[PDB]
Ligand SMILES: Cc1cc2nc3c(=O)[nH]c(=O)nc-3n(C[C@@H](O)[C@H](O)[C@H](O)COP(=O)(O)OP(=O)(O)OC[C@H]3O[C@H](n4cnc5c(N)ncnc54)[C@@H](O)[C@H]3O)c2cc1C
């Protein structure tokens with residue numbers, strides 16, 4: 021009676037709302053807070069994310085803010101930063117876009133897309149039936165129930181929705197404290213502006229923003245200014261700090277927890293509600309948005325009819341393995357940034373040396389920026405899959421008449437699966453007539469590397485099925501029926 | 510002639526190289542009955558390659574070496590693959606240090622070097638022409654004069670003390686107790702490394718080792734049981750007669766100068782590190798071979814002062830890195846499940862990469878060592894190791910350059926055909942010119958002035974004139990004949 025209800029007006033939530041509308045489904049976002057607050061957590065959108073935004077024509081809107089970094093760094097190692105030039109991408113850079121500004125854009129997009137955004141409605145409880153779900157809400161006018169076919173949790177890390185459906189979501193206890201907060205130019209008139217990793221902690225100051233991580237800290241009331249000064253026990257000179265009017269200033273730990281199932285019947289999880297990690301390398305919102313886009317088109321499909329149950333299960337099948345690795349890279353990154361001068365500095369030396377290597381630099385570059393993600397869904401047996409299944413195609417360019425460059429990124433904005441003819445294969449095209457909602461665009465791309473004559477491309481940029489010369493129409497027939505349900509009458 | 514202090518491996522080796530170099534060698538060893546037992550050894554490729562240059566390799570292969578090769582920092586899934594590095598000997602010699610000393614001693618005995626076992630050194634004194642060491646023998650004290658004195662004792666080298674060299678380094682914060690014991694309790698435990706939270710243990714028979722991170726008289730058996738606080742089940746242990754059993758720390762100290770006038774340092778007397786990856790004796794023996802021929806030369810006349818200075822210039826940078834790799838290795842070896850396990854995962858993944866596996870493989874086994882001495886740009890072969898090349902020429906018979914260096918003399922390999930260079934090398938004494946063909950030469954090379962230690966001193970591309978080589982010889986091996 022109200023299609024799909026997403027809980028949380030965060031980035032992930034707004035994104036998911038857009039993809040649901042772009043997918044022809046009613047979206048409803050209930051956001052706890054009333055006046056959005058990003059401030060801290062100042063954001064940074066990496067390549068795979070940026071590439072993804074291009075598939076939605078949203079990239080143009082984010083480039084008014086001067087992104088940059090081509091790119092680096094990694095675990096406080098600056099001498100040999102991550103070089104984006106080593107990975108195949110049409111967008112070899114990161115969008116330095118403050119999360120506050122990001123939410124602003126995503127909200128505006130969902131508003132115009134036709135999705136209600138009541139800001140100021142916390143969710144008290146839930147209840148999952150066999151056909152639909154009901155969420156108890158607490159609005160200014162007062163409480164009220166709400167029915168919808170599916171409910172997705174896109175709130176914070178303390179997701180109530182995760183609680184109310186019981187999902188754990190194990191993870192590790194925090195042993196790293198990190199206090200941050202903006203406080204411009206109090207004492208000293210031009211200290212320093214380096215990261216610096218003393219013995220006892222690692223600080224990061226800036227004047228004409230302070231950040232301090234302590235390793236080995238597990239009753240506490242909210243965090244105070246004087247709380248931050250002593251936290252700078254890592255430095256000799258004791259600025260602390262001072263005032264200097266306060267701004268935001270928060271505290272963060274290195275608990276690495278993650279939902280054991282992204283799905284529980286007809287409840288789903290995304291963004292921080294599904295994975296929680298230390299804020300190192302700015303992978304949080306990146307992983308979230310991509311979770312959203314991966315689910316959006318899949319869920320919208322399930323609702324409208326063609327989206328099968330198997331299809332929805334793949335959301336977790338694909339996105340869980342990804343976040344696992346994020347939690348791990350952040351935990352290992354912390355090991356590399358450890359405040360030990362006796363073993364860890366030596367190690368950092370060697371590691372910096374390997375970041376000089378293209379092979380290894382490309383590796384960590386891929387891990388962080390997301391370019392390394394490839395899915396493994398709906399593989400046959402016995403008949404090994406093509407080299408293109410799961411690979412990302414959102415960054416290809418086509419041509420054909422006149423030799424005009426035609427970005428596949430622009431063709432996915434329709435939010436519909438594609439079939440790229442690349443070479444010339446009409447047998448496959450004709451086998452795809454019965455669709456609705458898959459379009460067949462004909463072109464001619466030489467790469468195709470490894471070679472490929474056809475690419476069944478998902479709404480999210482990733483390839484679902486790929487065709488070599490030997491691929492018959494009958495093979496593709498089944499691949500469509502499985503990915504996008506039965507043909508027309 | 511020359512007095513080396515210490516009947517350890519390094520000391521015995523150095524003795525041999527001095528005799529092979531035509532100089533009198535005298536080894537004074539503190540202890541009377543040699544004791545290796547613990548520290549069970551392992552000789553890696555560059556070392557093995559080095560032993561081949563001395564025809565000693567044949568004698569060490571009666572014991573079944575092995576490992577082709579691995580592991581690395583307790584990471585077994587993806588061990589170091591020796592097959593990725595260019596070498597005629599892609600393996601490590603699993604030769605117990607006790608057995609090793611046995612061989613090296615026997616070799617020096619027959620080479621003509623006195624080995625009085627049971628003569629500690631009380632003090633020293635360095636003149637302008639010679640050095641005198643005060644000794645404490647069974648018959649009683651006595652002074653001893655020699656042109657040069659090399660310290661090849663333990664890590665607590667008195668010789669290092671008596672010449673004042675520091676030798677900074679870091680304080681130990683890692684305790685490691687080891688000791689042979691069986692079958693103390695249980696007839697069914699395990700045989701894995703295992704890295705718990707709190708420490709990392711390593712048990713065996715049906716051989717105990719326990720490292721604790723965060724600990725700053727003599728060590729007892731009951732001392733070892735509690736050290737196994739890292740494990741739940743408390744074997745501890747028990748007795749089961751004892752055997753050796755010692756304690757070791759991770760202090761990473763190293764001499765600030767391998768040379769002080771006419772005193773020299775080698776082996777543990779020059780570098781000290783945690784026993785991880787068995788790089789201790791390896792680095793030592795190579796120190797010895799690098800010094801041996803250089804020092805023997807200085808004594809006999811042709812060995813210049815500049816030449817002897819290069820011993821430190823070359824060998825110091827090497828041990829620095831060893832200390833560092835061991836310290837970083839310890840960082841990789843836990844005992845943190847919260848950050849360090851995750852890191853080990855990624856690192857294991859990179860050890861799957863050939864490029865990276867080749868890297869760590871080179872670092873450990875020594876294959877990555879290349880010197881940078883007497884540069885004018887230099888050829889691609891200066892400093893590179895040549896001891897593993899094969900020659901041919903008539904009949905097409907394989908002729909290992911390893912076999913030609915046993916004479917302990919510098920060589921000049923003609924490879925291609927360059928007589929202008931040969932004729933320019935007639936005046937020597939003690940450099941020999943062997944003619945042969947080798948297509949590799951990779952990067953290409955027509956001539957290779959090879960040091961007694963396997964490493965290339967000077968290399969020749971077609972453009973290299975006789976005049977260039979002329980100077981290169983005069984600098985490396987002193988003036989020509991009359
Ligand atoms: C210091 C720091 C620096 C960071 N830097 C980067 C970076 O550079 N690049 C990058 O990509 N990521 C970065 N991150 C990641 C970070 O921004 C988060 O991971 C990201 O905001 C998560 O997306 P989300 O929408 O799911 O979370 P949120 O934004 O927290 O979603 C919260 C929303 O749902 C909330 N909510 C909670 N409970 C309910 C309920 N019961 N009912 C209704 N609503 C509810 C609402 O309050 C709401 O505003 C950083 C994080 C930190 C702490």
Ligand SMILES: Cc1cc2nc3c(=O)[nH]c(=O)nc-3n(C[C@@H](O)[C@H](O)[C@H](O)COP(=O)(O)OP(=O)(O)OC[C@H]3O[C@H](n4cnc5c(N)ncnc54)[C@@H](O)[C@H]3O)c2cc1C
Nearest residue numbers: 515517518519539548551630662663776777787789790791
């Ligand atoms: C548990 C353990 C395991 C190891 N495993 C390996 C491995 O697998 N591979 C590897 O390459 N290395 C390994 N090592 C390193 C180890 O073998 C040393 O590097 C080697 O013993 C040092 O050689 P050395 O001769 O210079 O010192 P030593 O062997 O200690 O020689 C010292 C000798 O001179 C001593 N001496 C001291 N003072 C005097 C004096 N005043 N007068 C006369 N003599 C004196 C005598 O005691 C004497 O026996 C290991 C070390 C330990 C502790």
